[PDB]
Amino acid sequence: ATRIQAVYRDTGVEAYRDNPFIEALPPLQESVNSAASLKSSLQLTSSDLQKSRVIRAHTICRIPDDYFQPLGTHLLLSERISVMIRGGYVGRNPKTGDLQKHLQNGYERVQTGELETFRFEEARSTAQSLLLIGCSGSGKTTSLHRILATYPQVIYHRELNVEQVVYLKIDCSHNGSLKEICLNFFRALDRALGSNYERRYGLKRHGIETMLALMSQIANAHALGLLVIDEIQHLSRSRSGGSQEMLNFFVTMVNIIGVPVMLIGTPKAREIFEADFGAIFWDPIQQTQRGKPNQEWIAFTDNLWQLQLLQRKDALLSDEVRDVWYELSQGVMDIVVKLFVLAQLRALALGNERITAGLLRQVYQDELKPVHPMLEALRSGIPERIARYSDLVV
Amino acid sequence: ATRIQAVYRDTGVEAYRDNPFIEALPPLQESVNSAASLKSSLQLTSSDLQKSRVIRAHTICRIPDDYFQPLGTHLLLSERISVMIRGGYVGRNPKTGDLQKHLQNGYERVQTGELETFRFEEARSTAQSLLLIGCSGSGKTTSLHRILATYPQVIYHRELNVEQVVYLKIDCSHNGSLKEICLNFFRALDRALGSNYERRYGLKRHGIETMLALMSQIANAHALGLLVIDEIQHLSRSRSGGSQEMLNFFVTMVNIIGVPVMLIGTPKAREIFEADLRSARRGAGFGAIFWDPIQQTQRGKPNQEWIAFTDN
């Protein structure tokens, strides 16, 4: 709970002229500066190379946690999410008296139980929706965390008495239950506020038709900027005739209530959407763009290579090493870093301090057994083989 | 075990600089020297030769309970266990008190225009996992009650009030039910701290999701360091649900709970995790270890390990 007092800025947009919620948000960065903000890497030191073997081997294992190198798509995602967060507060101005009319419309939705009723026709929603699909290991969670780490979440206003919540993240239940998605929301809300809402709402005997309204009203008492739901493919493994009503409620909320909604899912989750939103697609990177090597792959590999703690290290990367690195990993982001770390740890353990092709082959063959069939299918390139299995590239 | 009062010792790695939980642990050791610390043997070899036959039989019956001899495959496992235990504590640093002022100063400076970019906080994503596979009778539990026996279990911190449960061990059941895995956690935590978690949480009628969201709240009050799940073979479609929910439960568990998880099983239990790239990505998150029996020879000449195991 990063509870920080608010100071009001001076934006240049005419639509954001007097809104406290938009003015209290940190200023938006340019295209150049936003990429520089996201970049992070392990610091390393000149004296760290010459230390004990254990002291080094406990430092190589920190590479995956403290390394980030943004590609082109991350800037586009950051811009889209910033626009979605900032542009949804124009219909919920508290100074003019537009937020206080949404809260009156939402009381009778609790009383009646039907989420299409209204009392003031002047109340309007100005929210949008987003959908994200990509193969496993692409980085759909860590990139979102890095993007949203810029905003301060809980902000306290003094002239008013509200505590604006800029964003919130939950995940779908494994069971596909309808009563657990409405409880994860309350748990994640009172974890980031310190309050106790699960005892108020979850504990009482409530049907889904009224939990789906209490959830939406308590999402408006605190001005909630954005809601992101992770692992959306779990909705398929639900009771018959149960997957559709949440899909209808997530689009009722954006259209009527006004709370923006973002969804993240595996390519297995398209069969419950296309058969029954704005979609942005993510794919593994490739060496060959049109007929020449893709500069981003070389950039990523070269930036990763400077993190070695080996005493006898090669100065520059050879072409064959990069070719083997791409052949074994097949472009997925998560396998690359783990293969690097495991190969380096074996290099320390054996005694030889230089990474070679044979060392990479031995580590890949011995230590990564369970991931063999999927990478082999992706390496075959046959559409029938890639279409097999699940949670792979579309 | 038992509430050992903490005594802090400095660690040579920069990232482990100021964490009470990491510093209260036993000091770092070399991999070669640590594997030799597990050796044990019987001290009665010559002094007890002349005695009655029943006493000698009673002495002989205790050979497979007190004779342990390390091999070349224990040092890798010991290193992995040490790194997994110590590396999961960096994001759980309790000693911080200047966060509010620093964050507010950064906010003011980025609002006025002096500073361009800032980073407030970031949540943690996923915990390290490991897999150990080998045939039965190969020694996957005798060799792991001794790697974890060089650590204290419960440690009491004087300045704070947390009781750092260093590790915890549970076993799967023959039924393979998903509700008896969330019910052995509370029992094993009760058999160590002498608390009353099973009555408060387990006995009430709660869903598997609600009871899994309570296992990540009492694993945070006590800074639990490692969780070991043994006999993972018994989930091979034994009972209690379909394969897809049986595979979703583990993924949600790894995503939710903050502690590292280790899994031990039989060569028939890799068919569970060899089904989709998510399961194989999380099972082999920190490498996969496959164990094989001793061979007489590797290249022409006989193995020295066989000679040393059948001579001592």
């Binding site: 206080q100 009319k101 009381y107 009383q111 008495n161 509200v162 108020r200 309204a213 008492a221 605190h222 | -």
Partner: protein, 309 residues
Amino acid sequence: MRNFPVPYSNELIYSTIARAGVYQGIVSPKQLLDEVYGNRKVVATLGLPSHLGVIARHLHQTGRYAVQQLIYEHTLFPLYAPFVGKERRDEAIRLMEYQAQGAVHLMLGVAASRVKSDNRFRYCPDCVALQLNRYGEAFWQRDWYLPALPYCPKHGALVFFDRAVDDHRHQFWALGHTELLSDYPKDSLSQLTALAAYIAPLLDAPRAQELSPSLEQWTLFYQRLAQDLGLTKSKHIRHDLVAERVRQTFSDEALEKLDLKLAENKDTCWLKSIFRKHRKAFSYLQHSIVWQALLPKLTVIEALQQASA
């Protein structure tokens, strides 16, 4: 509660608590009582509330609203304190903050003042339009809920919902029936509106926090008023000139609505008693009618200052 709505301009605490219940969607009144107050046995009081410590605790993070501001800005207290006495006023201010409901009513005699409190809810058609245009909300107002005179000072009279606050002792109710509008153009007399306009600025008076004469001061000031009006005789009263002046200023039918009628035949009337020895506290109306009848050159605050002089 997490966040408690700030009170609007000239609004009772009853409306604020009702809005606090509305904003977070708490339908069962018992749950609202659990969330705002500690216990389930606190009554819903409209005008002169108790338990005013927890509300100020809820609004603590803001630097504006304290207990003293809540006593005089969002309560009917300012028209009770100057006419009861300094010691009793100080005891009321000290005691109403803590857990005491019947004690303050018994000590100020508000329950004894009116055997039938105007428990029926009120509604001003024209004021609600300005509230909707300005704030986007509808809330109860202090000008509507005068203890005995149901006239809005700015315009006309007040319609009645006919629902009583005493029907449910544990429910806080909010004005939200789609602003139910009806025409009730009937009026008794514009003198009632003039009296309401005269007494209205007493509610918002910074100098009303400290001015509180004593019984001896009250009787000597009334004797001085009888002297300087000149309508007094040796060891007696005129008994007719003051009645003639009141009749000129106030119509008898108008006085019928205020439940106060002059009885010249019998000697229990308040008009003689207000010039005789003071032994019991008098309401604001009984002073205000005399003020409007005999001394119209001064407003209520100036008259109070002169009396305390």
